[PDB]
Every structure is written in C-alpha cells, then in structure tokens.
Amino acid sequence: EALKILNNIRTLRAQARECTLETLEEMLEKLEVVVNERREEESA
C-alpha cells in the first residue's frame, strides 16, 4: 500500500511534505543500505 505511492514522484512529493528534511535524509540512508544489501546478493 505504501510502496504503491512510492513508485510515483508526484505522489511521493505530497507525502514528503509531512516530513522534515532530516527524516527524509535519514530514511534515504536507511533505504540505501537496504538496496545495497539486495544489490550485494544480486551480484554475488
């Protein structure tokens, strides 16, 4: 449900309006390492 609206930049912009810059940056870093983990397994 949440990953649905996350696939579109327009909808994403609206939800990112209720979160401070800090939270956005923090969550980005958290997602980054998660994708990195998957990428690692995907390439290994």
């Binding site: 649905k4 696939n7 579109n8 930049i9 327009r10």
Partner: protein
Amino acid sequence: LTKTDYLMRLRRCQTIDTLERVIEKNKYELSDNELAVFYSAADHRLAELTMNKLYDKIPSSVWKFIR
C-alpha cells in the same frame, strides 16, 4: 501486466500534454493493481520525452526533470 506493454502503448502519445490527458483518464479506469506498473510506464515515458532521448533504463538524474 508488464510496464513494457503500457510503455509501448503510451509511447504512441507525444507532446507530453497528450500523455497527461490519457493518464488522467486511465486513472479512473484502472483497478489500482495494474496502476503500479502503469506509474512506471508513465514516469518512464515522461523521462525519455523530457530528455528527448529514448533509453531502456532511465538514469536517476533524469527523474529530477519530471513535473
């Protein structure tokens, strides 16, 4: 369905403005389940059209030009 199918169907629309009309209408036709890949198709189509260069994969820095 695959996002590639929708991409080919949406690639028939040009001027960008025409694309905004079809996605607006289909928005009330889709059952939300296919909307997932439809979003990717629309975003993908807009990206290639904005940069004026068709690419299979869309570079991350291109999403910045999407309105």
